[PDB]
Amino acid sequence: TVVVTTILESPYVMMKKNHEMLEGNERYEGYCVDLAAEIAKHCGFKYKLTIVGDGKYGARDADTKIWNGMVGELVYGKADIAIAPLTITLVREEVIDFSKPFMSLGISIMIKKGTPIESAEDLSKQTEIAYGTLDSGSTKEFFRRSKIAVFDKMWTYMRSAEPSVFVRTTAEGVARVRKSKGKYAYLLESTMNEYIEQRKPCDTMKVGGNLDSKGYGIATPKGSSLGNAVNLAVLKLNEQGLLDKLKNKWWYDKGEC
Known part of the structure; x- marks a missing residue:
């Protein structure tokens, strides 16, 4: 067996x-x-x-x-x-x-419905809305190692952002989007993003194209x-x-x- x-x-x-x-x-x-x-x-x-x-x-x-x-x-x-x-x-x-x-x-963006963000470039261009990734793992490493201008600007912001934009678990990043009144956007896998988008309370939204392919x-x-x-x-x-x-x-x- x-x-x-x-x-x-x-x-x-x-x-x-x-x-x-x-x-x-x-x-x-x-x-x-x-x-x-x-x-x-x-x-x-x-x-x-x-x-x-x-x-x-x-x-x-x-x-x-x-x-x-x-x-x-x-x-x-x-x-x-x-x-x-x-x-x-x-x-x-x-x-x-x-x-x-x-x-x-691939890496995607999760927003609470209503936040004025449609892409990684939108995120990279502002400061009102905070954004982060899981505290240790591929997504964090992706930004850390990226030579792409937008993703590097995003890394420069995230590593130094205060209070910390990094979360201990995927569930926390999701809860953080839901509880931050549109002031926090989460970077995670597209599969998890689109799954949560089809779960009650139905207050989250996946936006933009994937940042990479896995x-x-x-x-x-x-x-x-x-x-x-x-x-x-x-x-x-x-x-x-x-x-x-x-x-x-x-x-x-x-x-x-």
């Missing part, structure tokens, strides 16, 4: 309230739960859905040289495959294999017997229009706005 590691992140994987009365993969619901089923069916394997032990995605601690999250669970043999909103990156790709992307995404891929260890088949299944699902049906289902058909 293939051990699938994944993470509790809405709308990808969610516990079904009455989960104790249920068993196996039946305790979970979400985009990645439906995805796991399509992939297992098309790869010819039976599987068990497990939630990553430390609730993390996958990062190598520079001091201990130890991978945490779903990446660590693959690299240390705790799970066979990771089917979750796991971004395809160069550091992760050096220790594990990724399938072709099953979903695209993708979530399915992960397997180097030399995995699963690697080849899962990659072909991802391509086949996209071509049959299934990934789009799946995203629409979990983001819009189940929308509240």
